[PDB]
Every structure is written in structure tokens, then in C-alpha cells.
Amino acid sequence: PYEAPDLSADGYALGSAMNNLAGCVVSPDVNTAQFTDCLLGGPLGGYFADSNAGFTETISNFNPKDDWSRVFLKSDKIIPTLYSNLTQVKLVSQNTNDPVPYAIAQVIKVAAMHRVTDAFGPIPYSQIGANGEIATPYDSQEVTYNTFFDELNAAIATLNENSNEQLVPTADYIYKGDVKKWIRFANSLKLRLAIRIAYANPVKAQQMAEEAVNPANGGVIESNADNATWNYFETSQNPIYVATRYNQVQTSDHGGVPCLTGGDTHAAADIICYMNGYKDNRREKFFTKSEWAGQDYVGMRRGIVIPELKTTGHKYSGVNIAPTSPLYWMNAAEVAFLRAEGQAVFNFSMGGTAESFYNQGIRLSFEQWGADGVEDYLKDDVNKPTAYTDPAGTNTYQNALSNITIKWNDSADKEEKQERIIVQKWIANWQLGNEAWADFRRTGYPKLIPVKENKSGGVVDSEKGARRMPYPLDEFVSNKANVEYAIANYLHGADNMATDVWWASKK
Amino acid sequence: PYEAPDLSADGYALGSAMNNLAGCVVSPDVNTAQFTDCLLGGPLGGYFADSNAGFTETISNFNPKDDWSRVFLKSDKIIPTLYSNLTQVKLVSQNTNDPVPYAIAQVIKVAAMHRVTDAFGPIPYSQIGANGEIATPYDSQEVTYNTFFDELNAAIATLNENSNEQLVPTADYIYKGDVKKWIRFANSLKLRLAIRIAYANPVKAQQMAEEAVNPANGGVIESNADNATWNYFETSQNPIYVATRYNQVQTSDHGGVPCLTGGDTHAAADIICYMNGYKDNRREKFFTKSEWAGQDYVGMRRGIVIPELKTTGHKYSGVNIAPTSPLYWMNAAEVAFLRAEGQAVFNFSMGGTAESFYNQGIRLSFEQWGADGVEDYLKDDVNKPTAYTDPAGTNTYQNALSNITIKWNDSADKEEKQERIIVQKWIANWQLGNEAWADFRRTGYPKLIPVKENKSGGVVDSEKGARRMPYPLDEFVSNKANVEYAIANYLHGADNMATDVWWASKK
Ligand SMILES: [Zn+2]
Ligand SMILES: [Zn+2]
């Protein structure tokens, strides 16, 4: 039946706030998402390559300007937006005697903020102000992670208790206000963060992980239908799409044929080397074809002298994404691969065999992307990642990136089991650069092509890569005593890109 | 069931094109919509008032710069966008042996383009190029209108024949691809254009109007569920919202309380005078409260020395619209009032008594906006529009705008019947400024407050107001022979704002 507008229902005020919160994970603001996800996460995670020759100072070359590296902490579109809206939702939940919106808001808060600590290490968190003021004492990263678990646990408790209630759908382009899906996502995120800390605090990691997958707490994401995917662009412009297409070559400058590969960002060589080697049917779903003769898929190397787009850059495979594409937060495949690693590498009780979880992860990913042939792929014990023959001949890498094969081997050593899991988890997490970067730092997988053009002045290792972002210069201006205290006490290393964050403590 | 992305379905290419077409009626581009609908249609239609004191050259004061008046013809977001996408849809329909998308596209084309001729009079139309090139011979407005009817008729024929088919829903935020709704809208638009020409060609008008409401052709919009409303902003920013809020006063500059009335555009005095007088329960739905003591609703006068927003402008009632609000094209109320006028004023066979259509229009409008009290309103034969006592004391108008009462009087003279119909039609069409402006030019109703600050140098009459926009200056540069020919032969008057367009020929 026809329903009149009612700006007054508010209802309306709530919707604005909840949608604003969701925008704090991956920003709908193009320039913000460009920094956090196209220029930081994508390249550092082995997915994307910078492809504007004018970008002479980059994160991927390890000489970023403050204005590139700082964004997660300094963008008013992130922390101030998150906290201001949190404050409003908390008040709505109180006023309406309905705890559901604030509970979901707390899940979104962790989804947004773990990305921030994962980038810098110690950050302001527990003491952040009502309006997202970060001119406060820092938490150690360990304390931050502890707080994340507490917040998720509280949210999960509230949602479970209100499992029959709902959020108005117009307030939620992830799950349309479905409380049970939010519970699954919250537990899934809890699992992500548990495996993150598996080296740093194995006791806590095991406890959190086993709680996450325990039916008594409402379960994890086990189906693509339940992916944490932000479908907020059906009537506008996906920011990764816009940002990757910035400066794309015009048809009239491309022989009268459109160029489909994008502009400022292309697909990375690394992921394409693996997927080409593996004859992976997901390729056509992830990437645009290259314009290089006889090669359907070839990525641009990360950490090079970036070529001119107009001459050669435009020929490399691009990111296969549309204006109406959603933004991913977390998928079912990742949950399966977390359980696989939990069991195989850390001997956690994940609810099934590691082999079963690994295979299911791959099946979930093929299903997610509509790719056929998963059953033959799963059993492939022959095909290996390729080396990187640059069609331009400038940036060739002579070595196969790894010799790791797809088929599960239950008699493999832990190190090999971990590599296999992370390689497939990484493929499945295409576009979630920040997550890939975190996993690479924690595990050392996948093995990537080392940086060639390392602009760090010897500070950053070409293989180990960027371990973190340096602290924003403004911290030393507006928050000096507090950032200095964090450097001295919580960072456990110099304030530069070579220092590992706390959870990155694998032997 | 879970469905994978498939950018390849195209399917996808079609969706982009169809959504692009819809954007050519009222643009989602904020600055474009600001010009066509906030600064042109809204004020000229008696709905909105310009409220930036820096706007010293305006359409509403009758001294517009070329860059304000030209937009409908010169914006690349309108004609070039429309035609380029039309060309693509035509090819898709051919290639897929499916005529439905092009048929709907033709309805959108007329919806977009009638606004353009209605603004200027003679325009390029029949000869416009594949890419929306307007450097071509002009049509007379009569020829343009003839072409509109032919195009609508062809569309309606195709849709009727394919009444059981569908358009993919992601291609259509008006009707979700429902072919029968599109038929109703097409006939409704045909009726709008038929009544438009009721003075200029009564023979044709009657024929088109009676065809439009004939069941054999599939019917008109008779329910709010079937409104031509573009619900394209649930996840972004309605352009009328953004544009009306430009320069809104900041809370810290407003005594620590938010200001809710907007910035660059406020609600007009005229509509509020009628609605206050009529004790109209739709007021709270249309407008924000004013900040003037003891007065819930008071609009800003149009065509004045525009005051400073910060001092007094911000106190006037604003437009009650949200970021997620849709954009209206045509509603059920309008159809009812077209039928009312058709029967009462022109003796067309509309399918019912004029009284019944008038009352139904008012009922539809109350229902549309969720307003109670329509039954008592309908029977009100006492309450009259007010005069305009400016709370600021600067721009007071001492006369009641009209003495016309709400209740239908079937023994009234045609002139009174027309006024009553148009006044209620005008109220019901809140936000559709261009349409109100057209009706005012054709009928002389509603009676408005005459312009006080008339910046036209004596060219434009303060009561009759702007009769058209002058031709864009670029026409004399890129299309000289053709625009001059149109002035000499088709315009039937000087190229200025005082000359009536062809359909505006009431005695
Ligand atoms: Zn190209
Ligand atoms: Zn105010």
C-alpha cells in the first residue's frame, strides 16, 4: 500500500545516523576511499597497483607524503563521522528503549576502527571523545584489541537477546535490519580479530575464536547470502570504481576504441601471476582483460617507476568493478579460511576438519563470483603460480612467486598448510586490501613480488614491505605528549614504516 | 537465492543508460537541478524564493545572467546526456529484439524535453543529433508538441502490445520495470500536454485528452501507488535538498540551536498565504516551521531585495525535504485536476463530473502527503487566502492574493471554476515549479503576489512575470542562422522574457 513521506518519523534521524556509520568502514567519499583502499590497502595487500606516472610519492613505493599516509586517523570522514553518529545512536537507543540500533552500531564501530589500529599500531581508542576527538592518550594495540572483543561481546549479547526484533531496513544496506545476520557478522569479525592475535596472545585467541564459532553464541557467516556487503551504490557511484577510473584514457586518445582498464589504479601483477598459473576461472570476474597481445590477464607491478598511462599503463588489466558495485566488508569464504587456519595451524576447535574448511572457502568464493569449475580446481595438485614477464619488458621478475599448489595436503608441514590457506584466502578477498595487508604482515603470505623501486631511503625492506604507516605529522602538533608516550612505550620500535605492530609477532 | 555480480550481463549497459535517461528530467547533479528547478521553476511557479543576498542577478527578479537562464538548452547534463543514452537504448532494443526499453525511453524523452520547450518556446527538437547536438534548425513549438504526441502514441502502442513483458527493475527507480505503470504515466503525460494546448489548438487538445483517458489505451494514473516519482536517492543526496540547503546558517551562528529552514532557497510567501488562509493540514508536510514569533508558516516573498540569510532570511519557512527524498515528475492529483479542467472549462469527455475530479484531486493530494482532514477541507466555503504581512516589515503586500474558496461550486462561471481547479492543482504540485510556471502562463492562475523588485528595465511585467527564458547567448555563436530564423518566424515576438510561448494564447 501507498505510504506517505514522514520526515518526522525519525525513524528518519536514526536512518541517517546508521547509514553514516556504515560509511566509516570504506568511505563512500571517493577521495577518502582512494586513500584508504585504493592507494594504501590495495597495493600493500598485493591486489592493486598505482598507475599514475605523476604519483612520484606513494605508499606503495614507501615514500608517502603525510597527506596520503595519515588519512585513517586524520580524515574527518572517518573517526569524527563515526563517533558523532555513535553518540546520536546511543541516545536514540536510550530514548526509544530499543537497544538494537546501538548494538549494530557497535559492530560497525569495530569494523571501522580495527582498520585504523591495523594501519598504525597504537592509537587513541578507549579515550576518544564524543565527537571523535583523538587528542587523547593512546591505547596499546593489545588494549585496543581487548576493547574490540569486549564491544563485540556486548553487541552479540544484546542482539541475541533481541534476535526476534529488527532494525528499520532503510537504516541498513548490509542486512536490511536483519538482527540474526548482524549476529553472524559480529561473530565472524570476532573470529577475524581472534586469528589476528593468534601469535601475540594465543590463549585469548583460542578462547575468542572458539566462542565465535560456538552455536550457543549464534554462529558465523556460512553462506554468501549472509556476506557483509554494503549494497549502497545501486543509484550512485561506488568510490573504488570512481577512484580506479580517475584519469582513464579517453576513447579519442585510444584509437577510437574505449579503454576499459581504468586510470589511477590497475590490477596488481602479483594476484594475476597466481591466478594465471592456477588457470583460475575467477579471473574474468576480478579483472578486465589486458590490451597486451596474446595475454588476457597481466597486472602492473607494485613499487616500480610508474609508467605513463597513455603509453603503456593503460594496457595492463584493470579492476573489474562498476559504478553500482557494492563495497565488501567480509565474506563467507574468509570465515571458512579462518576456521581452516585456526584448526590446521593453531589447533583450535573450529567445528570441522581443516581440509573441509579450506575446500569450502574455495567453493564459497567461486559461488560468490559465479565462476564454474571449482571441483577440478580444488583437486589441482599440478599448476603453480607464474613468474612475471612484463610485456613492456621494463619490470620483469624472473622467479615464480611460489611453488605452492592448490590441492589440500593434510600431511604437509604447518608452514605449507598456512601458505596454502592464506593464498586462497587472499584470492577470495580480492578488493579487501587492508585485510590482505594485515594477513601478509602476520603470516608472511602470500609470497609476493618484492618492491623494485624502493623510495624509503633504506628504511623499509623490499620484501617485508610497509609494516605500518608512520604517525600523522599533526599528532606532534595537537597531541604531542600522547603520541610521544606511545612511541616510547607502546610502539616498541621507531615511528616509521619498518616497525611491526603488536599482533605482527610471528617467529 | 544468492546471485553473483555479472557486469557482463549488460543488462548492465542497459541499466546505466536507462538510469541516465531518468536523470534528464530533474537532474541528480545538484548544480544543474539548482538552476532548472530551484532558481527557475520554483520561483516562477510560486513555490520557492531565492534567499542568498549575494544573488543580485536572478531569474525571479527578471535580470538573470546567461549562465542561469540557459541551462535547459546548454547543460551537457541534459540534452547531450539524453540523446546519447537514447541512441544506445535504441540500439539495445534492436539488438535484443525487445522494444520495451526504447518505448520507456521515449516516454522519458518527452518528460525531459517538454520542460525545455516550455521554458524557451521554439527549440531544436525534431532535428537534434544522435549525440544531442542542438546546432540545427529549430521547430516551431507547435511542431514540437505534435512530435511529442506522436512519440507518446508510438510508445503507448509498443508498451500495450508488450503489456505482459517487463524491464529489469535495476533500470527503473520510477516503476521497477512495470510496463503497465509506464503506460499509465505515458497517457497521463499525454493528458498534461493536451490540456497545455487547449487554447492553441482546441481540436487537437480534445482528441489527445479523450484518447488519454480512454480505457482502450490503457488508462491514466489514478492512484498514488502509481505516481511518476523517481526514488533514486535512498542511498545518496536529493539535489533539491542539497541545493536548498546550500549556505544554511551554522548552529554555532544560530544561538547554539540548529537552523532547519535551509539556505539559498526558502518556501515562497505565495503558497503559504493560500495554505494558511485555507487552514491546510498539508502545511507541516510541505514546509519547515518559520522562526518568526507566533507564526508557524511564513514564506519569503519572490522578486524582492533579497535580505541577508544570517540576519532575517533564515527565519522564513523552508522546503520540507530530506537527502533521501525522491524527485517528483507527475502525480495522481494532477491527473484528476487535468480531468476536472478538461470537463469544466473545455467540455471534454473526461469520464466523470468535474466536481468529482476536483474533489478526488484534493483527496489524492492529502493521501499522498499523509495529511488528515480532507473531508472538512473539501467542504470549506468560508476560508480564503491571506494577505502577506512580512514579519520583517520590509516586503509586506496588503491585499489578499485571491478570495477564491475551496468548495466546488458547479454554478460558478468558467473563470472561477478554472481558478479553483488551478489553485488546488498548484498546491498539490508543490516542488514541480516548472509545471506550476507553465499553468500560470497558460491560465493566469493562481493569482500571485506581484514582483516588487523588478530588475528587467521595464521589459517584464511585475504581474504577468517571466513568459519565457531568453535564448542562450551561445545560440548566436554556434547556431546563428537557425536561432535568428526562429526569432523571425516561430517566436512571434522579441527574444526576451516578455514574449509568450505558442501555447500561452488564452484571451
Ligand atoms: Zn587502453
Ligand atoms: Zn534559523
Numbering used by the authors:
A (entry chain A), B (entry chain A): 31 to 537
What did the authors write?
SusD, in association with SusC, a predicted TonB-dependent β-barrel porin, constitutes the minimal starch-binding unit, with further binding affinity provided by SusE and SusF and starch hydrolysis by the α-amylase SusG.
The crystal structure of the Bacteroides thetaiotaomicron protein BT_3984 was determined to a resolution of 1.7 Å and was the first structure to be determined from the extensive SusD family of polysaccharide-binding proteins. At the time of deposition, BT_3984 was the first structural representative of the PF07980 Pfam family of SusD/RagB homologs and belongs to a PUL with unknown specificity and very limited similarity to the archetypal sus operon. The final model includes one BT_3984 molecule (residues 31–537), one acetate molecule, one zinc ion and 705 water molecules in the asymmetric unit. The partially occupied zinc was tentatively assigned based on electron density, coordination geometry and an X-ray fluorescence excitation scan that showed a small peak above background only for zinc. Structural analysis of BT_3984 revealed two tightly packed sub­domains. The N-terminal region consists of three typical tetratrico­peptide repeats (TPRs) that form an αα right-handed superhelix. A mostly unstructured region of ∼100 residues separates the N-­terminal TPRs from a fourth TPR located in the C-terminal region that continues the superhelix. However, analytical size-exclusion chromatography, in combination with static light scattering, indicates that BT_3984 is likely to be a monomer. By analogy with the conserved TPRs, we propose that these variable TPRs may be involved in binding to more variable members of the SusD-anchored PULs such as, in the case of BT_3984, a predicted uncharacterized glycosyl hydrolase BT_3985.
